[PDB]
Design a protein around this ligand. Structure first.
Ligand SMILES: [Zn+2]
Lengths: 177, 141, 49, 76, 117, 83
RNA sequence: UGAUGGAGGUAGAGCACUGUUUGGACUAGGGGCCCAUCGGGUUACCGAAUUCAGAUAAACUCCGAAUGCCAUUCAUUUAU
RNA sequence: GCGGUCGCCUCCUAAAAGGUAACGGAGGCGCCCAAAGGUUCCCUCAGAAUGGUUGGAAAUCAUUCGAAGAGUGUAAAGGCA
RNA sequence: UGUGGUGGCGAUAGCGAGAAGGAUACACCUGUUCCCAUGCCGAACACAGAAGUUAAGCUUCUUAGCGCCGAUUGUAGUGAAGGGUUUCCCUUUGUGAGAGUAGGACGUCGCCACGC
């Protein structure tokens, strides 16, 4: 795919330039993409997860899970064992093809055009860059989707400080403002 | 019937204690202090009376230090009730003081007003007292 | 709810064992594989009718 | 007008043989509730955490470093 | 992310195996050691702490790579060196592993070549 | 990949309305038109309206005669009257 | 009686756990109300993030005695 | 006399083996689970900080610190990483 | 003698901090066709390999910041004798802690194999 080729060609020796790494193993890679349809309304009517999974199965290449509860909250009417949300992890080469879809198609199809907010820091190489709508992807059907909720993306690197992750995402598209 | 200071309960009735002797527990805040050199219970109200007999010679400055606090509780039955049934309802909050310990402390005021206020205090407590400085330290500062 | 119960050997026709159940969690009759002292062999046991 | 005055019987725990004895097979050594002393050589644990002596011999007590103690029987 | 180590977990599994029976008076241990490129084994008594016979993968006589076949050769070596000193009823360490591959390759090769389990 | 319980996917080559980027993969399907050897031998029909160059975050300021339908819906009828 | 090994959490210390608590430093941020009908949140109490010093406990313990108790192919005297 | 109590299990009083009373100080019981049992594998909690759509002090997430501050069907002790 | 495996001994064995290394070995890493696997995910688990890197893990060396082990000595407490108020205190004789310390301490012992 494209993004391993960019790592092999240009990304790694530019990293050895801009941080003076003594070995190639010092270079930070990318590991995960975690996605969370946080519904919270299957407790009211259980047919809310029943289309969130339908949307995630199209967006990803996997099926999501169904998440448990671990608590019992009076205000949201929660007990133990409650179906609330749905994880999707990504590994391997479907990391890079989904990131190709993110860089090319998705991120320029949002109103109030600014791209990527630059403050997602967490100090330690993790930019949770959420999604407001759902109609962004090419595979979204107006004749199927009703609610106007959104997604989660947890970009996970092995980088120590956020100076490194900024340069990696600068060398991987990611239109910061 | 004026109680200044109380606790939050966690147990109503407590065993009537048994106090023998103490030591140390010296001046550390702050510059002039008492020493109760007998051993007695000391109730709430005595510490109110000691407060006010302190503070009416502490005009515009000088710190008051209260180092003893009523933790424990007495109980008492009625009059006309025989011996017999369970322990009566607790009325009062009293803490023990052995020898050695220090009732109150003062700082920020010269010596004469200090000994005035301390002898005004010690006629309201049932223990023979003394008056001791923060006498010597490794650094007095 | 619960009932002190007895088992029944389905071959030698005896009342051998005694145990418990909760008759709203188990509506139908118990069947366990137990040991029969009369035949000296593992034999299916049902609930006494 | 009191709602107290309730107890259990005393159930008589504690070590029932010292060190240095000659101890026959299967006799109780230190009756517990809750494991306070673990077994070592030739000593097992019953249902209510008691401590036997499997083989005839001499009870001696030990310790597992810092926290807890051991019982073990040496014949021989 | 800390990449977690891969011997701390193996030795936690050793510690939760070796509680029950090592028991190596005259029915000693075996051993099974993965690596990325080797398979080792030892025969250990306690409370001597002293091994009795051993063999290893890439030291002496090989057949393939990180194969079951190398492990079968190792098990042949261990069982043949053991029975020259009169040992019959050794006890397996599982190590910290399972029985799928590279381990039963040692095991059932060691059974048929003299040992007893 | 656990068996039978994962969704559908084929590495579908992109296109565009303008200049046609042809590199990528996809998941959804259609009627195949250009199975292409230089890429994945799959559908072309992901034919997005966005190049990620058409938006003025990469190329620069290019919208003055931008001439797109609803844009011209006001800016042609009186837009000939405008200019 | 002497020697030796051991079981245990009383007395005293009693801070580390849980309860009761006293003064100082501090805001992450609350104020009836401000400067108001974006930042300074004047004064105010400051709980918690904390952290210095100082106390208390039958149903608090990081610790821990004399003594008694149980044992010994052990020693001396005695006669149970 | 009117009140209260009468069997069982935990803690304290109980004087550091065991035992020890009072119309002394505190709480539970007269069941439950066909898996909450047996074995064989695998696993490690409560919280806090920092970011992230709905989303709120407090749901699903992500990284880090975290010997226990958790859980153990049920009262209390003794245990259990 | 280096490295790996593998054992006991109370962390005096630890935690934090810093430096160095790849002969062998160990580890990371490449990949999934096969035994096998994910309540989704070759991340682990399992199996095939060997392009490279000592960055991490691992090994060696330095360090008394946190933690651990701490003698002697003084005091509280107390058995046995006594004396006053009798709530409590004091004197001879035997035993002594808890705190607070000087100090120890950045391990010790045993086996097999490989390379040298
Ligand atoms: Zn029968």
């Amino acid at each position: 795919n494209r993004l391993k080729e960019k790592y092999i060609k240009e990304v790694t020796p530019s990293l050895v330039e801009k941080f003076n790494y003594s070995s190639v193993m010092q270079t930070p890679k990318v590991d995960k993409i975690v996605i969370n349809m946080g519904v919270g309304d299957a407790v009211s009517n259980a047919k809310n997860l029943d289309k969130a999974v339908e949307e995630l199965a199209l967006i990803t290449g996997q099926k999501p899970l169904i998440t448990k509860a671990k608590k019992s909250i009076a205000g949201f009417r929660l007990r133990e064992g409650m179906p609330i949300g749905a994880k999707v992890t990504l590994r391997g080469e479907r990391m890079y093809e989904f990131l190709d879809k993110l860089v090319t198609v998705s991120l320029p199809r949002v109103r109030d055009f600014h791209g990527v907010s630059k403050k997602a820091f967490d100090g330690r190489g993790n930019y949770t860059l959420g999604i407001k709508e759902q109609l962004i992807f090419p595979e979204v059907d107006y004749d199927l989707v009703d609610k106007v909720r959104g997604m989660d993306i947890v970009i996970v690197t092995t980088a120590n400080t956020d100076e490194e992750s900024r340069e990696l995402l600068a060398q991987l598209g990611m239109p910061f403002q | 019937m004026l109680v200044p200071k109380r606790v939050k309960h966690r147990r109503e009735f407590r065993g009537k204690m048994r106090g023998e002797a103490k030591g140390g527990k010296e001046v550390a805040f702050g510059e002039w202090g008492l020493q109760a050199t007998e051993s007695h219970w000391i109730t709430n109200r005595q510490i109110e009376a000691a407060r006010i007999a302190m503070t009416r010679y502490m005009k515009r400055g000088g710190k008051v230090w209260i180092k003893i606090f009523p933790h424990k509780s007495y109980t008492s039955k009625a009059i006309g009730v025989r011996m017999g049934k369970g322990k009566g309802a607790p009325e009062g909050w009293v803490s023990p003081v052995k020898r050695g310990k220090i009732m109150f402390e003062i700082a920020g005021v010269p010596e004469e007003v200090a000994r005035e206020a301390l002898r005004l205090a010690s006629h309201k407590l049932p223990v023979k007292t003394k008056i001791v400085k923060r006498e010597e330290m490794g650094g007095e500062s | 709810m619960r009932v002190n119960i007895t088992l029944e050997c389905t071959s030698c026709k005896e009342r051998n064992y005694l145990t418990n159940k909760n008759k709203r969690n188990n509506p139908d009759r118990l069947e366990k594989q137990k040991y029969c002292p009369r035949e000296r062999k593992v034999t299916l046991h049902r609930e006494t009718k | 007008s009191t709602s107290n005055g309730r107890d259990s019987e005393s159930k008589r725990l504690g070590a029932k043989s010292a060190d240095g004895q000659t101890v026959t097979g299967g006799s109780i050594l230190y009756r517990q509730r809750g494991t306070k002393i673990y077994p070592g050589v030739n000593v097992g644990i019953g249902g209510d955490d008691t401590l036997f002596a499997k083989v005839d011999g001499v009870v001696r007590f030990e310790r597992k470093g810092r926290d807890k103690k051991q019982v073990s029987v040496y014949p021989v | 992310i800390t990449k977690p180590d891969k011997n701390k977990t193996r030795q936690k599994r050793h510690r939760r195996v070796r509680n029950k029976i090592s028991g190596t008076a005259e029915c000693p241990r075996l051993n099974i050691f993965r690596s990325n490129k080797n398979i080792y084994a030892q025969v250990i008594d306690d409370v001597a702490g002293v091994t009795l016979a051993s063999a290893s993968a890439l030291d002496k006589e090989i057949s393939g790579g990180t194969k079951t076949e190398t492990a079968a050769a190792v098990g042949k070596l261990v069982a043949e060196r053991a029975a020259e000193k009169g040992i019959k009823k050794v006890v397996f360490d599982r190590g910290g592993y399972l029985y799928h591959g590279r381990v039963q390759a040692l095991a059932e090769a060691a059974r048929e070549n003299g040992l007893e389990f | 990949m656990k068996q039978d319980i994962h969704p559908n996917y084929q590495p579908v080559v992109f296109m565009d309305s303008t200049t046609g980027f042809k590199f990528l993969s996809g998941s959804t399907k259609g009627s195949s038109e250009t199975v292409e050897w230089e890429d994945g031998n799959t559908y072309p029909l992901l034919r997005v309206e966005v190049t990620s160059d058409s938006h003025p975050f990469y190329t620069g300021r290019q919208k003055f005669t931008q001439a797109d339908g609803r844009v011209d819906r006001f800016n042609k009828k009186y837009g000939l009257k405008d200019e």
